[PDB]
A paper describes a structure:
Theoretical studies suggest that the most probable PT pathway comprises of strictly conserved residues E282, S319, E279, and C299 (from surface to H-cluster, numbering corresponds to CpI), including two protein-bound water molecules (Wat826, Wat1120 4XDC19, chain B) located between E279 and C29915,16,20.
Corresponding to earlier crystal structure data, for all CpI variants a space group of P1 21 1 was observed with two copies in the asymmetric unit cell (chain A and B). According to their close inter-residue distance of 2.8 Å, R286CpI may function as a salt bridge partner of deprotonated E282CpI and thus could be involved in the PT mechanism. In case of variant R286A significantly fewer water molecules are observed in the same region. We therefore assume that the loss of the guanidine group in R286A destabilizes the network of proton-accepting/donating surface-bound H2O molecules near the entrance to the PT pathway. However, as the essential chain of PT pathway residues is not directly affected, the influence of this exchange on catalytic activity is comparatively weak.
Author numbering: 2 to 575
Amino acid sequence: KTIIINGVQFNTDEDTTILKFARDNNIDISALCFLNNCNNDINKCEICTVEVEGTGLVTACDTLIEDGMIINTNSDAVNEKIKSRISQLLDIHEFKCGPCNRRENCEFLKLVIKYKARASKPFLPKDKTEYVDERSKSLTVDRTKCLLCGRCVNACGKNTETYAMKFLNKNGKTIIGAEDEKCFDDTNCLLCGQCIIACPVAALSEKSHMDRVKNALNAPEKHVIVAMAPSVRASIGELFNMGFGVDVTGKIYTALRQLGFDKIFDINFGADMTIMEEATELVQAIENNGPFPMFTSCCPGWVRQAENYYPELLNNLSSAKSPQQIFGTASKTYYPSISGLDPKNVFTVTVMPCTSKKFEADRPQMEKDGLRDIDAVITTRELAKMIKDAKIPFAKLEDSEADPAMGEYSGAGAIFGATGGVMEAALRSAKDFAENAELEDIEYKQVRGLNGIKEAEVEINNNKYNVAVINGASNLFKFMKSGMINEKQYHFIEVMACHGGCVNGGGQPHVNPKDLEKVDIKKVRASVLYNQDEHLSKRKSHENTALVKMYQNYFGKPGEGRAHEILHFKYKKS
Ligand code: 402
Ligand code: SF4
Ligand code: SF4
Ligand code: SF4
Ligand code: SF4
Ligand code: FES
Ligand SMILES: [Mg+2]
């Protein structure tokens, strides 16, 4: 093909869109509703407008290149068209960037600045209560910011295949929301927050828990524990212009100490706990020749997916609590026993890359003796905002260590944030358990990677079993519907709601499509975790010294007794 773009001649054999071809050839074309190789088919934003000679104005994001095309991307007709569209968007947009949580990384603002657009008449609502929905424990909607770009709808469609995020006709006007405009919690929504990640503006956010945390920190009698997820240490640096794939663990510890937190632990410890209980459970399931298959239960998005679509699998879920909830359970029991603290005065806070964790933490039965396992859950973005509000120079902070009692962890718990991590860790412990040995080769690279459905054959006590790793909720739906589950007899299956694992969680830092093109965010974030794994002395969860001490002195043997009594949680079908 011979393509003419801005007077420059190209000769290509590629069959792609004008947008992609221009992007690959250093030619600037703006875009808004185009994301995940999809645009808003019904009401296209037309920000990607270009002028094709002989045809007129077209949308470059969904228009294929053709030989003989003379394309103008910067003609004044194009520019005033785009500016017109952006102006129309401003007409329905509360343009107050000051107290906005997307102030420092908003695509729409950058478009407005770029094309110097102004609203015909400024959108300034007196009563935002009609536009705001905070009923959910995980998600919040602010339709004063919504551009109706449909990126959340699409993202929900491709990531989960639930379409829990829909276009709705709210008595006259088009909005986005859950079915029947109900609270997302009351629908088949997984609360995975991929819709948030896809949103270019502040229309979609996480349900804030920062006030819980602040009030806890300022409360004189409250002893505040904080523990961050595996993924957090490999992600938050992005929000401080430190780049991608930067390990900032120690900096996070220091910052958390400077935020006034009373105890600094780590969720990876709880991951090691989860591996203790669940590998014990898998070994005893193997010895009893059932029940098979056993699914992981550490992902609340997947748990909700089972509750809403496959309730018959609820009893197939591991009884072991998620790292978060099991850590929280241990923090209200074991920790006071080794600290002398009043359990009622303990306030446990987790830092998560996930929004569904908020819902999981606020489950009614996720407590004992009136004491919540987890009292508050803040996202990576929330912790970043908290650090910035305290004016803490994160990038320049020196490394510190976590409090050892419940802060030590192995590489097995370290790789949890990546797809296949839980599987690999669980195998590392189960193989050692069932064979009564301490094996040398512990790397299971077959369950790693970004393949949607991963399958492996493992040999435990010289008998072979089939394991599977489901990477994404849509892939769970594919795995079940296509009958792949019934092809062979699977024994242990990992399921994560977010593709790539927790490192691509709904509470993770937003990434400009600019870097989505240049950086493989999932692999780059996971690489930090695996790098931590290969550089750790202990790479098995049952070699965690602090954890071993905890079990020996307090819980006893995992999988049974008080361990099974309080560190486990089972879900019931209706
Ligand atoms: N609880 C828990 Fe997990 C652990 O450890 C996180 O904390 Fe994950 C991460 N990162 C999240 O959110 S949940 C699903 N299992 C894999 S990793
Ligand atoms: S969503 Fe973006 S453009 Fe709108 S107020 Fe917030 S920062 Fe400004
Ligand atoms: S909530 Fe965000 S992603 Fe969804 S339509 Fe509105 S602006 Fe677009
Ligand atoms: S939280 Fe997940 S399942 Fe729910 S609407 Fe958003 S993307 Fe869809
Ligand atoms: S994969 Fe991780 S971040 Fe995503 S919903 Fe599950 S627990 Fe949350
Ligand atoms: S980006 Fe092409 S129509 Fe929206
Ligand atoms: Mg399209």
